[PDB]
């Protein structure tokens, strides 16, 4: 659910 996970 967080950023930077594509």
């Amino acid at each position: 659910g967080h950023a930077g996970a594509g």
Partner: antibody, heavy 117, light 114 residues
Framework: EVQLVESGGGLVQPGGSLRLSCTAS????????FSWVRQAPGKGLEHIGY???????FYASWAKSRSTITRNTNENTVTLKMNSLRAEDTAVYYC???????????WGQGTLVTVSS | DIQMTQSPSSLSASVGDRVTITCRAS????????VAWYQQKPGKAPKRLIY???SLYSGVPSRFSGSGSGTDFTLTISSLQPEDFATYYC?????????????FGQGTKVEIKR
């Protein structure tokens, strides 16, 4: 049950490097993304970088040139390395899942790194 | 870079007062939702009170409430109590599908008026 035990740091000479690690207990270090934060004496909180749960590290513009954040799944740890330290890098450094949009938040106890000759 | 600002930086209030601390991010936060409010007292580590704008964590008194959207957020203490005098920080998550960042506000120190 759950804890984040921080270790390392102390004294560093100008131009030297610091190495801080945090061992997770009660959960797996790969399950979440973890940040590194510092607070200089009598100043506010400052974000250094973030290691996503996927294992990708991203840094604040000011710390990118000197900082390296890694993790060790075998030992269940996350580590911060900063070289080329200066006097203004003196601060209490924290490892933490900040939990800005999720329920799980946890911080290390913090450790003082004094950069001085 | 990404920068967050809180208003005010310092404020003096009395027990029972209503306190409102604002926080604006230079850009919209991740999912217009990833903002948490922390509480820190002298010589102690920061303590998270609110996450995802308005979600209250287990054990946090209900007098604390969070609101806002995207770039602007507000911490509200309905009735200020003695244990609430401290420094409050807003922290936001940012990034894309390919990068991720966090940022803190400068902090707001709530001191007791006398």
């Amino acid at each position: 049950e759950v804890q984040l035990v921080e270790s390392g740091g102390g004294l560093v000479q100008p131009g030297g490097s610091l190495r801080l690690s945090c061992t997770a207990s009660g959960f797996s270090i790969d399950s979440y993304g973890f940040s590194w934060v510092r607070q200089a004496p009598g100043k506010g909180l400052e974000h250094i970088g973030y290691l996503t749960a996927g294992g990708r590290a991203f840094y604040a513009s000011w710390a990118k040139s000197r900082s390296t954040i890694t993790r060790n799944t075998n030992e269940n740890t996350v580590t911060l390395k900063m070289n080329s330290l200066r006097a203004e890098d003196t601060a209490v450094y924290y490892c933490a899942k900040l939990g800005t949009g999720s329920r799980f938040a946890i911080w290390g106890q913090g450790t003082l790194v004094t950069v001085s000759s | 870079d990404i920068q967050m600002t809180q208003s005010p930086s310092s404020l003096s209030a009395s027990v029972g007062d209503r306190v409102t601390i604002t926080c604006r991010a230079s850009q919209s936060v991740w999912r217009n939702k990833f903002v948490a409010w922390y509480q820190q007292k002298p010589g102690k580590a920061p303590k998270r009170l609110i996450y995802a704008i308005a979600s209250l964590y287990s054990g946090v008194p209900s007098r604390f409430s969070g609101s806002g959207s995207g770039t602007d957020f507000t911490l509200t203490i309905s009735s200020l109590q003695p244990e609430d005098f401290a420094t409050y920080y807003c922290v936001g998550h940012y990034g894309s599908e390919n990068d991720a960042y966090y940022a803190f506000g400068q902090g707001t120190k709530v001191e007791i008026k006398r």
